[PDB]
């Protein structure tokens, strides 16, 4: 099985554009000193000081 023809520039860009990463963040993250922001998932570790930058 092979591509019989080139995919038009339009459709190739549509498929290429349907390739993205997710966005997750949290504000109001209180740790020792500066309130560095993390994601919710690792918030508990941040409260325990188990992160590094």
């Amino acid at each position: 099985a092979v591509p019989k023809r080139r995919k038009s520039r339009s459709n190739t860009r549509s498929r290429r554009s349907q390739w993205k990463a997710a966005k997750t963040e949290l504000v109001g993250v209180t740790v020792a000193g500066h309130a560095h922001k993390v994601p919710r998932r690792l918030l508990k570790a941040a409260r325990l000081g188990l992160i590094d930058f």
């Binding site: 998932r41 508990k44 188990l50 992160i51």
Partner: protein, 116 residues
Amino acid sequence: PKPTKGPRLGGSSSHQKAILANLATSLFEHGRITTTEPKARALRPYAEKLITHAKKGALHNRREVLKKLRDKDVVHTLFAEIGPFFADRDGGYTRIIKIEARKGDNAPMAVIELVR
């Protein structure tokens, strides 16, 4: 504990067994193990049960655990300090905390530790 759906860890279930035993050994000998989250999840009820047997305390409990952990020094520690210490608690002796991922495999890492 309960069987696990899907693939066994690493290779077959025999390898999974060896993994859980050695991680359990490290846990009792340190108190804080940083590993992958799936393995920590699987590790909970196993160590939880072992601690339950330590809390009870008996010869046949030593036989039962020794069927799993060939090393004895950790059993001495378990049946001397840990079990009795956690005697004043009815289950739920572990805790799992989410950890920042590993650059190289994006592993959802996690640390499992004893409540105290």
